[PDB]
């Protein structure tokens, strides 16, 4: 067998990216300032964090075992619980004390045959009293919100129609449905997309099979009152390339950024219209909604070249690290139109941005507040000379948050400091009567000066000032998505505005 | 109530002394080099580690909640398990989310009435299938060796005759007895010493009540074939001073270092002889034995002034940090002699030393190998300019280990590096047939460059070279005592030579 290294090597696991790999508890976290006492609930986040050194050199960040953090808040006190998802991969490699799963999304490189290849490392959401640890090549793994015990692979009481479940389901605040899909839904390289939904009682509602024009990565999607929308990243999969040990994904410069639109209820697969946006990278969706005229406004991060540069085109062509910027774009779509090509989008701000969140009380409807990560290259915002030698590689960088008011056009920027970077933020309604976008924002910070993580709590009245700074004595390695579960919400999700 | 701080402040909790306060697991620790595959067992160590910020400013290191680390070794792999002892203090303060116990060994400063004030933070030993987490003001707390679950306060099946159980019991390798005592055995300020022992079946054997000439600190003791020996540190307790908010301990320059000698079996309290060594500090006992003539050779660390300088005399007189050196001393005692004063001891080496370990297969008998911590002030051994600003205060420093062969006089010195310091080492017999002092030494290192801990594994054939270096991604705060429990020893303790 390929030799199992006994310590981590490579820039993807150096400095702040070095795995810690701890599970357990740290109660009564140190706090500078004061956590508002009305805040009650839990911030769940997930990070990729390899449990064992890979036999694949320079294994991407995206292929690390999912480790779940929960920050439990009550009466101005906070406790951390931390636990790895018990995926098939995790369990078998723990039993063997060596890595066994190979390249990202390529089963032909595995040292043993896996039934499920999930690292469950992308998102962690709440649904009907469980957490669902998500990875877009697999079904969810269900977990206990209180103990972070893994129950196992979840198939929605045998109703799950797809091999795959997106990392970005949407929760309709009015209907209380979880709206979902999976791509490569019948296996590696398939162009089948399964769109499906579940009512608040747990019963499956929609199930519509459709066909993608290419086998392209559909990481995120959008849901409006009457439509679901599938933006396709021009990374394309060829199973025959995989069989020879090649990458699951390869950039294709010759195709548009397809944007499928399907009626949300009652459709067949042939009802989908594959609109054609100018070539570019589909980043995360902030939110989408239908305006007065019934046209879809789709607000998402959008770049002009391959953000995932480590998977270049057929001839190895693509950008370098830190070259590609994504911008906050508005696309206008009309399901009635037979004109397939779409205009260039309008841009809402000029910042290099990603990881947009809204007040999810208006998800699928008109929103007027968006919170997002920014990466500002303006001199002095980040002390790169200090940070980069300590940072390792493989993960995106964010050196602030921004709050956009879409009515007024005002932008507030939170800057944690020259030697700190951020993860994705969460938004917490002040209380059940609060206005849209009024409450608290939390975000995990990497402090390169201390080589420790911190959890910042901000008030939306003034996003520039930390109301509290929760000081962890360990590193939480840069991660992906996270969610707030408020104690006052019986089903885990906030009430419609 | 005195206000509870919400983050740690003061030099006793700064830099490397900052509490981490984590409980749980880190399996498959990173290893540089190679852990010998024949090593099988567990290294248990305890550190003081305040779970909540104290309301007492500059609370000594000795008053921190005991947190147990177990390093589980098999086939060249190692896992860490870590868990706090569930003392009454720990549980009640966790329930309240604030500190409640006050000054070291002064119940008159507590905010609530405690039955048991143990922090269980001094030593962690194996006895009859349990761990015993030890603190000299209290009975032991019993724990599960595998899970580190706390069972609770342990009273030896209702046989425990004393309110106090020493942190330094001795395990007789021939008789398989645990030989014990407690001072302040009937409560605060009492001069009662209870000497007691347990046979390998768990039945109490000896129980002898005796009287100390002063209420002085008896931290360690010594056991030979026919005697038990009690060296008294000239720190003295006055309950009336405590009732006014003062220190439990106060140095007394006017008294000798008393050394009590009692027959090991069948004695009464009046059989004790209080010999009078020159005034000084009784450090840790390496070992004691009877020579050919029946005279006790007592080998221990011994200093000429108050090592615990933060508890000075009645007029605040005492030394400064880093001033007092302890040296490896041999005292000769004769229970037959009626001459109470003793000569100055001979010194075995010149190093400033502490934390002596022997091959416990010859405990209570003649030993010819001793391993110990050293602190070398010679320029370049420790880069003080780098280390001290990162170190915090409150804890002793050691920048190497030494191995003394007592027959040949040879000394080997392990120096981890200019920016590393050590804790107390453990010795592991190579196998059940190994000669005295032949095998492996392990020691926990504080790496001030990475702000991480490391566990070094050394072969006694060459103590200067690390065979392996186990790299923890977190800090284990400087701690106190630790022990090896070999898998091949059914009762947890090695077989006699
Ligand atoms: Co995502
Ligand atoms: Co001790």
Author numbering:
A (entry chain D), B (entry chain A): 30 to 526
What do the study's own words say?
Carotenoid cleavage oxygenases are an ancient family of enzymes that catalyze the oxidative scission of alkene substrates. The oxidative cleavage of alkene bonds by CCOs is accomplished through the use of a mononuclear non-heme iron center. It consists of an absolutely conserved set of four His residues that are arranged in a pseudo-octahedral geometry, three of which are engaged in hydrogen bonds with outer sphere Glu residues that are also highly conserved within the family. Taken together with the preceding structural data on ACO, cobalt substitution appears to preserve active site structure in CCOs without supporting catalytic activity.
The second advance was the generation of a cobalt-substituted stilbene-cleaving CCO from Neurospora crassa (CAO1) that was shown to be catalytically inert and allowed the crystallographic observation of well-resolved enzyme–substrate complexes. We previously showed that Co substitution in the stilbene-cleaving CAO1 results in undetectable catalytic activity as we have observed here for ACO. Although the previously reported crystal structure of Co-CAO1 did not show notable structural differences compared to that of Fe-CAO1, the resolution and data quality of the former structure was substantially inferior compared to the latter. To allow a more rigorous comparison, we collected data on a Co-CAO1 to a higher than previously achieved resolution, with significantly improved quality indicators. Similar to ACO, we found only minor structural differences in active site residues between Co-CAO1 and Fe-CAO1. Notably, in each monomer of the asymmetric unit, cobalt was consistently bound deeper within the 4-His metal binding pocket, in closer proximity to His197 by ~ 0.4 Å relative to iron. Additionally, we observed subtle variability in the positioning of the coordinated solvent between the two metal-bound forms of the enzyme. Like in ACO, we observed a shortening of the metal–His bond lengths in cobalt-substituted CAO1 relative to the native iron form, although the bond lengths for Fe-CAO1 could be artificially elongated owing to submaximal iron occupancy. By contrast, the cobalt ions in Co-CAO1 have B-factors that are comparable to the coordinating His Nε atoms indicating full cobalt occupancy at the metal-binding site. Our pre-edge analysis, therefore, supports a five-coordinate geometry for the cobalt site in both CAO1 and ACO.
